[PDB]
Design a protein around this ligand. Structure first.
Ligand SMILES: [Mg+2]
Ligand SMILES: [Mg+2]
Ligand SMILES: [Mg+2]
Length: 115
RNA sequence: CAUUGGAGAGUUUGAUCCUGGCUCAGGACGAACGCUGGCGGCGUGCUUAACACAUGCAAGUCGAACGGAAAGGCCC
């Protein structure tokens, strides 16, 4: 599973397997998947629609894919961050991020009911 | 107590991974060249020889400072 805060990455990450470093940052809605071919394919399959991904280190497709994979695995969903810190999401995480999560969920509700 | 923002590709090997250079996709210009060329709007136009320059023009004005009267102008 990949934690998406409304069609985008939860928080910036930097993953690296072997030598394939991949940097990921969340982006505002409508930004798209600004990523290289392999990392872009990984993100598009994961369902991220607004992300900025850069490929540092080697450009080998397999290693870049593994680096994108563990960069995504390093993602830490806000509820589990709160569980980690023994606090609440309203106490640990940015209000804008939480709000955007509510509007994403509600727009999701709209889509579901419309089905 | 969130962001307005980051894409790669080819090429060392029989094959692989890494390192690594080289090359390319983008944008730009006070540009030139080739082919081509309808119009309008707004800009811009010797980057080199601070090289040598024909010709015209680019700094005059004041008679309410002055003697005046060479012209035009009035009066004989
Ligand atoms: Mg390394
Ligand atoms: Mg060799
Ligand atoms: Mg070969």
């Amino acid at each position: 599973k990949v934690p998406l805060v409304g069609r985008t990455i939860t928080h910036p990450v930097i993953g690296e397997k072997a030598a394939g470093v991949v940097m990921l940052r969340p982006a505002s809605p409508g930004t798209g998947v600004i990523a290289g071919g392999s990392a872009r394919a990984v993100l598009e399959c994961a369902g991220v629609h607004d992300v900025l991904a850069k490929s540092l280190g080697s450009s080998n497709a397999i290693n870049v894919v593994h680096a994108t994979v563990d960069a995504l695995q390093q993602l830490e969903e806000p509820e589990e961050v709160a569980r980690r810190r023994g606090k609440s999401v309203e106490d640990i995480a940015p209000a804008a991020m939480l709000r955007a999560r509510k509007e994403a969920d509600e727009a999701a509700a709209a889509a579901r009911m419309e089905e």
